[PDB]
């Protein structure tokens, strides 16, 4: 009787890969062919942040556009003015192996982790005058790979041990789990209103997430290996995705298809980052080649280059205004381009 | 303000500056074979840091490249070792170590363990590895193993590394231990110098 | 949408002494940038690596117990995988997987027998035996 659900599997994904096809009238490429090109892309170096003592992993920027945490493995989060390339604060961690770093949108608070499996909370608001743990969210049984605040008290973390998971902060506690994956989650990225995320892994696929309701919407395939790094489109209707099989890919959620690749026959080398522009018309790349590529997200042609590292890009952030690219690297600077 | 900041920045500044003194002057470990375990020990005055990575979940691809700048890998294997061939799985791990491009120039401590379990065994091994039929020493037959074991691992480290690291193998007792981790970290150091002088 | 799918076949009931051609078919990837594996599952037991192959066909591997027996072959034309086993032995009775390695272009290749890796097939039993 084990027949009946094979057939029933059998007959529901025939079912989806029919009304896959069905929706695939045009291409990316054939609705933009007119649109204009981007033109060249030239960013320059407007600002090198030193002091960090090792390999810079992750950065945010903050919504103020001025201020930005990055996290070294040198066991620092390093909070700077990037107007006067002054440090607001030093933090000192307790593990060194710090993997994701957040700034929540207030102000307040920023949070890190890493191989310790634990989301820390440190307050940056003291009447004392000194930065101090507020919180650490333990419960995760594989390495802190992103984390992200939805607001003063509510964080999502993503995790090697292949979940996702929501926390209150003020309790200390993990509200809703979200499982599905079957390899190490890698990157999360929040939509902009705060009721879904899509999740990156390491079987190749993403996923969509309810974060009321605590259950896996949709699935995406397509890419071949790894996926590193994941980024909503800015309007929420689509994102990207960055993999070791050297490629981007654009997703359409309401399509429920690939719509775009972005590779090359010299990049042979893995996606480590991704971020869009303001508009979305830019897609930033940062590679294990060193360099940063500029696509066009609409028409899958390379447009520019960022390069001023000497190792591998870990990390990229766009500023809510879109003014400023941040560029983090193994060789333990962070760059401001323009 | 704009003058409270530049203060704070060069308070900043001078505590980063003692944070450096301090990184530069100890030595981080990779040990392998909640999330991570930390041990400190000092050897005549000089400080190291070895990290024990369990609380992870086997598959290892991704958060190994944390460890791409350590002074060294400290890799752990029970050559004896429903019974599976464990050994062709150790060769395989450290063979995909020694390649992958993060770690091409970190340098592997090689601790082969339980030899006395391989002396008492010895008396299992050429149904894997039929080699070791003709395989000659560089009792006699615990030698011949532990040797051909060992020659196994310097094949795959000698066929690709090509100067910027090398295998440190040892027959493994904590003090001894920790004196040649101490000794090989030492000529790790010696040899990367020697190699930028174009002496090596 | 694509995904990544490894589908073995081949595998049966044989005598011991007697000759299979295990085939694997690959679809989802570009076949020739990949390394290639075998890997076996026997009843009550680990993964255990059988056999690799490279992106070109230049360079093959081959864990003890078979070097002798078994010969992979890679039809990078088709993106078909092959074992041919001869000589079987009632010690090769298990469920064998066509594993790739996880990134392209690459030399290492991590974490082809864990226990949930993703880039594996389903499998296909061989049973030696009277």
């Known amino acids: 009787e084990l027949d009946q659900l094979r057939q029933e599997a059998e007959q529901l994904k025939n079912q989806i890969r029919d009304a896959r096809k069905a929706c695939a009238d045009a291409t990316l490429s054939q609705i933009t062919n007119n649109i204009d090109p981007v033109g060249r892309i030239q960013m320059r170096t407007r600002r090198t942040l030193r002091g960090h003592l090792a390999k810079i992993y992750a950065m945010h920027w903050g919504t103020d556009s001025r201020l930005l945490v990055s996290a070294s493995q040198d066991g620092k989060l390093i909070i700077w003015d990037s107007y006067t390339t002054n440090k607001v604060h030093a933090i000192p961690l307790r593990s060194s192996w710090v993997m994701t770093c957040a700034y929540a949108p207030s102000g307040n608070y920023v949070a890190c982790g890493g191989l310790d499996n634990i989301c820390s909370i440190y307050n940056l608001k003291t009447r004392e005058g000194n930065v101090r743990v507020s919180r650490e969210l333990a419960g995760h049984t594989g390495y802190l790979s992103c984390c992200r605040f939805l607001d003063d008290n509510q964080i999502v973390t993503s995790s090697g041990d292949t979940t996702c998971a929501l926390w209150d902060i003020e309790t200390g506690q993990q509200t809703t789990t979200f499982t599905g994956h079957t390899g190490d989650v890698m990157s999360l990225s929040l939509a902009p209103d705060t009721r879904l995320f899509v999740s990156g892994a390491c079987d190749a696929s993403a996923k969509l997430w309810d974060v009321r309701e605590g259950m896996c919407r949709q699935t995406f395939t397509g890419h071949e290996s790894d996926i590193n790094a994941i980024c909503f489109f800015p309007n929420g209707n689509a994102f990207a995705t960055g993999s070791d099989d050297a490629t981007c890919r654009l997703f359409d959620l309401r399509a429920d298809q690939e719509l775009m690749t972005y590779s090359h026959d010299n990049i042979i080398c893995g996606i480590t980052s991704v971020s869009f522009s303001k508009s979305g018309r830019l897609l930033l790349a940062g590679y294990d080649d060193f360099n940063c590529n500029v696509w066009d997200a609409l028409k899958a042609d390379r447009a520019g280059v960022l390069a001023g590292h000497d190792n591998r890009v870990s990390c990229l952030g766009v500023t809510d205004d879109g003014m400023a690219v941040a560029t983090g690297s193994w060789d333990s600077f962070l760059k401001i381009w323009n | 303000e704009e003058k409270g900041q530049r203060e704070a920045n060069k308070k900043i500044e001078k505590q980063l500056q003692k944070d450096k003194q301090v990184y530069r002057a100890t030595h981080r470990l990779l040990l392998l074979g909640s999330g991570i375990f930390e041990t400190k020990f000092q050897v005549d005055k000089v400080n190291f840091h070895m990290f024990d990575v369990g609380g992870q979940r086997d598959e290892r691809r991704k958060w190994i490249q944390c460890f791409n700048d350590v002074t060294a890998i400290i890799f752990v294997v029970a050559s004896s070792s429903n019974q599976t061939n464990r050994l062709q799985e150790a060769l395989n791990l450290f063979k995909s170590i020694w390649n992958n491009r993060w770690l091409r120039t970190i340098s592997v401590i090689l601790f082969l363990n339980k030899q006395d379990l391989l002396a008492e065994k010895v008396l299992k091994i050429e149904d894997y590895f039929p080699e070791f039929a003709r395989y000659t020493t560089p009792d006699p037959r615990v030698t011949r193993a532990k040797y051909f074991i060992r020659d196994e691992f310097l094949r795959i480290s000698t066929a690709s590394g090509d100067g910027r690291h090398y295998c440190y193998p040892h027959f493994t007792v904590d003090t001894e231990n920790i004196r040649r981790v101490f000794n090989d970290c030492r000529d790790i150091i010696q040899r990367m110098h020697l190699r930028q002088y174009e002496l090596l | 949408a694509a995904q990544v799918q490894l589908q073995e076949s081949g595998g049966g009931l044989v005598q011991p002494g007697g000759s299979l051609r295990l085939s694997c078919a690959a679809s989802?990837?570009?076949?020739?940038?990949?390394?290639m594996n075998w890997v076996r599952q026997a009843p009550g037991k680990g993964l255990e690596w059988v056999s690799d192959?490279?992106?070109?066909?230049?360079?093959?591997s081959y864990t003890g117990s078979v070097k002798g027996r078994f010969t992979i072959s890679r039809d990078n034309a088709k993106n078909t995988l092959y074992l041919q086993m001869n000589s079987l032995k009632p010690e090769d009775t298990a469920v064998y997987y066509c594993?790739?390695?996880?990134?392209?272009?690459?030399?290492?290749?991590?974490?082809?027998?864990?226990?949930?890796?993703?880039?594996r097939g389903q499998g296909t039993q061989v049973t030696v035996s009277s």
């Open positions: 989802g990837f570009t076949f020739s940038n990949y390394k």
């Open positions: 192959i490279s992106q070109s066909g230049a360079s093959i």
């Open positions: 594993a790739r390695c996880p990134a392209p272009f690459t030399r290492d290749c991590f974490d082809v027998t864990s226990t949930t890796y993703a880039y």
